[PDB]
Paper text:
Plasma membrane Ca2+-[name] (PMCAs) have a crucial role in this process by extruding Ca2+ against a steep concentration gradient from the cytosol to the extracellular space. Native PMCAs form heterodimeric assemblies with the small transmembrane proteins [name] ([name]) and basigin (BASI). Here we present the structures of mouse PMCA2 in the presence and absence of its accessory subunit [name] in eight different stages of its transport cycle. The structures revealed an overall classical P-type ATPase architecture with ten transmembrane helices characteristic of the P2 subgroup.
[name] was clearly resolved in all [name]–PMCA2 structures, including the immunoglobulin-like domains Ig2 and Ig3. The most N-terminal Ig1 domain, however, was highly flexible and consequently less resolved. We therefore determined its structure by X-ray crystallography and fitted the resulting 2 Å structure into the density of the E1-Ca state. The resulting combined atomic model of [name] represents, to our knowledge, the first complete structure of [name]. The Ig2 and Ig1 domains of [name] do not interact directly with PMCA2, but Ig2 appears rigidly tethered to Ig3 by means of two hydrogen bonds.
Numbering used by the authors:
A (entry chain A): 29 to 127, 130 to 148
B (entry chain B): 29 to 148
C (entry chain D): 29 to 126, 130 to 148
D (entry chain C): 25 to 126, 133 to 148
Write the structure that this text describes.
């Protein structure tokens, strides 16, 4: 089985200072890798990988692997510039990390909108 | 600006001659539009919109809109060249259908891989 | 194939607070363009075009162009003032957008909204 | 196309097999009265739904297009640092129809096959 999404991240609107969590759950054989990506504008030139501890540890990534892969992306103390398009990426392609990055992966996107308190 | 995927399409392996169905389920206020897109290689240069009747009518699309958007993409009599990356796209942005824009900019995407194997 | 309605929108009665969805399905070769128009009274002077996002984003238009043109018009949080004649217009005439609107066909539906009293 | 077009191929792109990391160059040379326009198109699978126009700078500048119009039209398509995903059908399209940009184009196709380092 090529990687497939069983749970996808879900768009959400938030207030600055709040926090959000996005979830990802993927199946396949071999077990797929999960990565979280982001772009201000939903276009390939804008997408970059996020990681546990990004943005001075406002960003947290907890990922676990078994038969399936599961992950939560969490961002606290939200700012306006956290708005944009977030993405769970999954692949069990053996060449998936060989240095256009989306070519061997699948993607499932969510929109995050952060509004200013009043 | 608020559409989200409740259920995204699921990757699958099929044999030549069979059929597949992909399913896409989305929430948003107002109700988001749904589209289906495809590419042999998962890069924006190769993605094109599929539609009801495509590929000599082997492709059907059935979509229903209420509070949610729900759609099924079905392709019958599968061939090797039906393999690739398929994609549900959703949006309720009022400018989602303007032409002066990289098609993905006002949409969100949820992808599945379809592999079609030769009966032999 | 000249643009032709395979399914035309159907008149409905609603109560305030509800939503309605009208449906328009047109065949043709090439595939016809679809527009939605509205008027309080069925007179030419009162018809104007509905756009996605109108009426404080209570108006949605989701149109798909395949073999057929298939469109749904949805309006939420219905008020008494949303009552009227709603119309799907279709055309695959090459100069349909370039000679007034004589190149489009119309199919109408009445939406009557009553107070949830 | 027989009524409002008369351009014709004098040099056509040539199929070729290459290794990942290498570069290729395809050539097109077209005659007619008036001078015909040249475009380069590509598809993974030789079918109309997959064909898209390429341009100078495509694929993160790996794709180069150099076209000159004198009496005839001549053009070179170059792709460097080749990947497996550069494989497929490339074609030169040409037309000297007035309405050509509003089919009244003609095409000459080549197959590119990229193999990895064994």
């Amino acid at each position: 089985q090529n990687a497939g999404f069983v749970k996808s991240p879900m768009s959400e609107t938030k207030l600055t200072g709040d926090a959000f969590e996005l979830y990802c759950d993927v199946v396949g054989s071999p077990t797929p890798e999960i990565q979280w990506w982001y772009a201000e504008v939903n276009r390939a030139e804008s997408f970059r990988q996020l990681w546990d501890g990004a943005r001075k540890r406002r960003v947290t990534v907890n990922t676990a692997y078994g038969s399936n892969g599961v992950s939560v992306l969490r961002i606290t103390r939200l700012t306006l510039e956290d708005s944009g398009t977030y993405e769970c990426r999954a692949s069990n392609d053996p060449k998936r990390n060989d240095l256009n990055p989306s070519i061997t992966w699948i993607r499932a996107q969510a929109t995050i909108s952060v509004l200013q308190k009043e």
